[PDB]
Amino acid sequence: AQKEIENRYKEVKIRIESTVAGSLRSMKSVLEHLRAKMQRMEEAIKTQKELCSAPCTVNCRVPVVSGMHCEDIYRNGGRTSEAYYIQPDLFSEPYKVFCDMESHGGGWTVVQNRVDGSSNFARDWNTYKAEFGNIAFGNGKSICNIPGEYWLGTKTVHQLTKQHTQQVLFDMSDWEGSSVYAQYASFRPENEAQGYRLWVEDYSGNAGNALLEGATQLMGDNRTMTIHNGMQFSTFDRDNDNWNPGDPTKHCSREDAGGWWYNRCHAANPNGRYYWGGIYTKEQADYGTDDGVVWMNWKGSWYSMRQMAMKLRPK
């Protein structure tokens, strides 16, 4: 009858005025919001592309003092932390390296260093062997004491320890004024033929023995599969990790974005994506993994350091 209609019609004006014009509206906003997000991005890209017409350059001078190691440089009066030239192998040319003369007694030859995503670390095997990045930038005068992002080549590092075993020291800083260390009394990687297999010894510090103890926040085999010690270097284009050695889908380097002594992946992951602000989510990770400048033993898997660096010293 009449109300039979007043019923049907009632339950429709509903859906049409709410259930639809509601979804309808708060949808054309998200789609609209997304677009503007993309423009801000497209513009931010066009701007940087434009400003890359010319590469950057460091015209900073060169310290007269020098040596084999930075330790050697320290012994020679180099007491300021800045870019120096060293020559550990007399049959190889001297190369620029950033020396840390302040921390833990100085004499520290920085082999890797993060501090602003100024350098891409997702580089192939050839590149990680040769070295990449900027050792330092001009402080304004012409002294390169502003450390940059770089990976002194693995091969150099290898030769460095082959000549005579070194001790490594990791210095990391969070995005909140805190900083930890983690050094091993013995550092040494085998030759390339052996995938530059890592070999550290004797932990100490407050960051967490991530290298030979794995991420302590993991239990059982899970933990052990994050121990880097004894592992081989693996890169973008060269899987040598301990994760399904046959399945090429199980590549700790593809996901985790860095060349590193990945072992069924990791506890520590310097060389990873430089997420800004520290925290990042599985949703943001390129492969849903904990890629990023991670050091689980301290901030867990989803926090990217603001500063990370690997330093070598003899004795």
């Binding site: 991420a215 599969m225 992946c265 990791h266």
Partner: peptide
Amino acid sequence: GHRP
């Protein structure tokens, strides 16, 4: 972070 380990793997499966």
